[PDB]
């Protein structure tokens, strides 16, 4: 019937920074998931709670497509039970996560000579992010025993940091576009069967 607009999620021209990741809810459509699995221009395609083959046979209450940009050696953190600057302060997956983490190298799009410093990630936080929580605040982080009151300095840091993508960077430091597909269960989004 209705086509699940996965192409508009994956082939979007611009992606959000991981700190302010985008979530698109997908609903009332017939998703063809092998379009992704049967064509591997992706570097990672890890599913949790479902097997990738059986995705076209199952139905789910809702689908959420979260998208953002990180660097290669951080894709490992987009998994249940991970720790790190991304999993703790930027994008946290739950322990009972049902869905798939899809990533692919975007060096040709998100790196530029002289450096692309547009993409940001959060460096600190008072507490770790709860699953599927999002923090877009820019309060000066108080790492010390003295209030910052808006001025950066000793133990008073701006919470977000730029990535600095240059085309010459090692593959572990190159930009990677990431789409996380979360399947909410309880038949608004179904496969072709």
């Amino acid at each position, epitope marked *: 019937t209705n086509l699940c607009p996965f192409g508009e999620v994956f082939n979007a021209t611009r992606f959000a920074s991981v700190y302010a990741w985008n979530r698109k809810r997908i609903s009332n459509c017939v998703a063809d998931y092998s379009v992704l699995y049967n064509s591997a221009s992706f570097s990672t395609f890890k599913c949790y709670g479902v097997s990738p083959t059986k995705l076209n046979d199952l139905c789910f209450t809702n689908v959420y497509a979260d998208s953002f940009v990180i660097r290669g050696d951080e894709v490992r953190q987009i998994a249940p039970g991970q720790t790190g600057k991304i999993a703790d302060y930027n994008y946290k997956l739950p322990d009972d996560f049902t869905g798939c983490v899809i990533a692919w190298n975007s060096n040709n799009l998100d790196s530029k000579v002289g450096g692309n410093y547009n993409y940001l990630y959060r460096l600190f936080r008072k507490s770790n992010l709860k699953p599927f929580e999002r923090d877009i605040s820019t309060e000066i982080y108080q*790492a*010390g*025993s*003295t*209030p*910052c009151n808006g*001025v*950066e*300095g*000793f*133990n*008073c840091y701006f919470p977000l940091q730029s990535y600095g993508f240059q085309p010459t960077n090692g593959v572990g430091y190159q930009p990677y576009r990431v789409v996380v597909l979360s399947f909410e269960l309880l038949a608004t989004v179904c496969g072709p069967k």
Partner: antibody
Amino acid sequence: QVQLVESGGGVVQPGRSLRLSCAASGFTFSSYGMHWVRQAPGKGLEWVAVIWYDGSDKYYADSVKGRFTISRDNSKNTLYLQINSLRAEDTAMYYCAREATAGFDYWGQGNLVTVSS
Amino acid sequence: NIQMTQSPSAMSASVGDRVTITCRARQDISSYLAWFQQKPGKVPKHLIYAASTLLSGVPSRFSGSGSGTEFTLTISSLQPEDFATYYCLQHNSYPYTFGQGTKLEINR
């Protein structure tokens, strides 16, 4: 005009107690966190403790936990370090410093503490 | 305690030499490493924090570098007022830990 003047140091016998003071002026005391640092004769610097601007959170060094207590009175603009179970390892010059935007930008003059009979 | 290790523990140089002092962390401390200067008998002077950010008044010939566990202080064009003992201190996590110290004396 910003100042940190210390007092209370001197001679104490092993096991007894001593309360070190660090009086402040020339700035808003309650706006700044405060640290203690000490130095045994001819030895290196040893970070001792820190106290939040509003009292509240306090932290100590490993070789000092349980025996020393950091505190402060914001109305008297004064920082304190209480000293107990005193051993020869604690014979040192004790400095207070303030933690500011520009780092540990101001320090006390230092008061000696000589534990011995 | 994270515990910091400085190297060398002492060295000598002439006025105008450039000198590097190393400070090593047992654990990863990001870039949150400070450098102190102390002349015999006087109160310590905080020179640098966050591995490379100078404090008010500190000359630019004091340059700090490093990330993770290996940090270095490079003093260029050594001057008579620079010969002293230098300490490092991680300010990444409590309890704050100082280094063993590096005594810098003139060669003569």
